[PDB]
Amino acid sequence: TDYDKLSNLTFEFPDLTVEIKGPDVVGVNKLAEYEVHVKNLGGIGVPSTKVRVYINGTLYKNWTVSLGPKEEKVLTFNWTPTQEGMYRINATVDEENTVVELNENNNVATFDVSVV
Ligand SMILES: [Mn+2]
Ligand SMILES: [Mn+2]
Structure with a gap:
């Protein structure tokens, strides 16, 4: 029943997607909690696929998850910045593209965070 700008209404293929949620502004040396949806x-389900989170292009955390048809999972990760500046958080699913999906172009999320 869930529908949003990242989810539109085929049942013969899975379709992996990712979205990042959390503070868009954080303070240096402060614990910040983010969620990868x-x-x-x-x-069609996905027995196994990899999810990765990058911060300014450098890998930060990785997960191996399974997702049944029309299923959603919330992955979490904490981040305590050490320096200030504009950081770009990227999240990817099936980056190695080992899963044939309805769309391979909605497998990447971008989220900007301002550390002050
Ligand atoms: Mn996809
Ligand atoms: Mn794929």
């Missing part, structure tokens, strides 16, 4: 919009 990984969903399978398709009618």
Whole structure:
């Protein structure tokens, strides 16, 4: 029943997607909690796929998850910045593209965070 700008209404293929949620502004040396929302919009499940989070292009954390049809999982990770500046958080699912999906172009999320 969930529908948003990242989810539109086929059941013969899975469709992995990712979205990042959390503070867009954080203070140096302060614990920040983010959430990676990984969903399978398709009618076929995904026994195993990799999810990765990058901060300014450098890998930060990795997960191996499974997602049944129309299932969503919330992955979490904490981040305590040490320096200030504009950081770009990226999240990817099936980056190695080992899963044939309805869309391979909605497998990447971008989220900007300002550390002050
Ligand atoms: Mn996809
Ligand atoms: Mn894929």
